Amino acid sequence: RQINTEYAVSLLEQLKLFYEQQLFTDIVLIVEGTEFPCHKMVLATCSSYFRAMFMSGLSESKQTHVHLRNVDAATLQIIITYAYTGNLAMNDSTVEQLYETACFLQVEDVLQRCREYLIKKINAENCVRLLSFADLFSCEELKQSAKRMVEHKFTAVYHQDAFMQLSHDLLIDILSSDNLNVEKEETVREAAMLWLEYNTESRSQYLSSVLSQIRIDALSEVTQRAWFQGLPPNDKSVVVQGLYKDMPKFFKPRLGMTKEEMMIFIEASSENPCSLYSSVCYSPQAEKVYKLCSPPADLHKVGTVVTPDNDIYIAGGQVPLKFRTVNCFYWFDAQQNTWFPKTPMLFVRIKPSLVCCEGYIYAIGGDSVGGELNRRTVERYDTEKDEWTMVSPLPCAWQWSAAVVVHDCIYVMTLNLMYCYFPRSDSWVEMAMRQTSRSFASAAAFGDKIFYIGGLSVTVEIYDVNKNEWKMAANIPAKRYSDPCVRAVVISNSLCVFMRETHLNERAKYVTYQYDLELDRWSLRQHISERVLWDLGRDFRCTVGKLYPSCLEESPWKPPTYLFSTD
């Protein structure tokens, strides 16, 4: 039936008006001296606790004064304000006490809202505290989310004071999990040692349970260092995705010992012409084809941001016109390998160029043309506040401008107006630029001297920042004139490119190049074969970030050999 909602809202606003002037107040709740007159029906039809307390037919339904203990006055006031309206005003300062009061009062709506709010607000500073909270209050979803977050950044959060005050079950369930993102077992060993020495008089009996969870006879990646590295070129990654899989889980190499440099191909293309905005991850070591889910809700024109902790992110976005410009934010995880929805921005960034300047992602322009107050708007990415504070905006429209941080100072070279993009002073001190006013200048983290190869015209200009000098190398080897499909990459902190200059058909000629700085010469690194690597585009996002091949969808879907000579 179409239950009337027009009468429902008038009755609700009338009940609120009556409650504000204290009419028909039949119950009086006493919390730590403070009195609150209220109606029994509203508390019953909102909280299952009050419903059971009133429907019992005892003196609680007859006495007008009810003393509620272990309940905060502010939380009870917020609950009543929800009981008489339904809108919840939650904040990061009083969300845990509100959730405690709700679970003590059993308000399904408030409980679910606080649960989802805590889930969508797990950061790397409260992960352990929220995990302890969920363990104390038995919230399985929040507990699992906080456990995954701790496993993702264990080496960064095991120093917090909340980690040493954890219970025994939390320790034995965190250490036993094979999802610990640690490069060496010594980190987990020292974490267990500091945990057991934090409070010795109460944990002296748990030393056996502590030592039984740390893998000592694992010898994951040291045994390969003992015998030799003798294998096909860098085939240690194949052993990673082999020995790990088949393991009794007691000597298993932790997930952090599987993290290996991976080519995160965001908004990439595939052999299928329909999937021209899909995603195919690649390993520059094991030479294997993996699958990726770069588009979350078919979100295109986004901006990949890999943090130093290897956490790929996205900015702005564009859903297919139901392109419908959207702002839904998404964070690519590594353990679950999924995009996490969060607070949307105020400006739709069209394929933005952003980096973690000073460990802090900034929304360096990466928009369109039509107003400096609307587009080209550098913002800030509040990590713990999960907010998007606006900062000094980019003066002119600068598109296809690779954003590269240099000495904790963004040095984004534009068409022909480079500035001193400051991550602290937020100013545009015109920095040494060039004379070629062109964009499409591919550049990755190349250290002191950056190289903005590209111009759609592939001059390898040297970008000296310390000496503030301006030299030049040469050009990309081609024929009469090759097509500039420069894709500057940074594999394991190196000066390389993914030039896809199509020559003799074969989709695009994917040839990686070796850039010299001390010799300042011109060489070639590797040559990605087209037998597996099919159409991938000419200027698509190709970030490089350490990722687990075990968690990466292991799906090649690309037949190698073709063109049989049988005819």
Partner: protein, 165 residues
């Protein structure tokens, strides 16, 4: 062409053979893809089993290192009447032996996986060896029919439309 000259009937044959030929090329490149995936499968396995071998070797090295410890620094951990201090090599020995047993079982699992995948690969590898003479024979008959039957009033576009079905 079974001594026929209806031209239209001879063309209908042409199409029937067209189907047979097309079906073959599809199964031919399918068998090629199977060959390639099986090749990379035994490659990923020959590397995993040699990794297993070298791990068993280094574990035997640790086993004899335990005997070396039974003469290096065991003098100050056995004559004192304590058992918790020796657990660093004594409780790390029995579980190492159990690890040896379970990785031997895992190696047997990988070996039976190898033989079963080799069986399921050779049961179709023999099909490749038998379908290729028939395939080239059908292609030779098609090429022979392309000299006479095609010159009896059929168009190249008609052949392409018969290639689609």
């Amino acid at each position: 062409v079974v001594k026929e000259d209806n031209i239209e009937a001879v063309g209908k044959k042409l199409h029937e053979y067209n189907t047979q030929f097309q079906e073959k090329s599809r199964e031919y490149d399918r068998l090629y893809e199977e060959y390639t995936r099986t090749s990379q499968e035994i490659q990923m396995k020959r590397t995993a089993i040699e990794a297993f071998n070298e791990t068993i070797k280094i574990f035997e090295e640790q086993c004899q290192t335990q005997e070396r410890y039974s003469k290096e620094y065991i003098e100050k951990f056995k004559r004192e009447g304590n058992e918790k201090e020796i657990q660093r090599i004594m409780h790390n020995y029995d579980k190492l032996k159990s690890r040896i047993s379970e990785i031997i079982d895992s190696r047997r699992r990988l070996e039976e996986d190898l033989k079963k995948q080799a069986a399921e690969y050779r049961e179709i590898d023999k099909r490749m060896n038998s379908i290729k003479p028939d395939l080239i024979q059908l292609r030779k008959t098609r090429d022979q029919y392309l000299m006479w039957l095609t010159q009896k009033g059929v168009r190249q576009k008609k052949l392409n439309e018969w290639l689609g079905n």
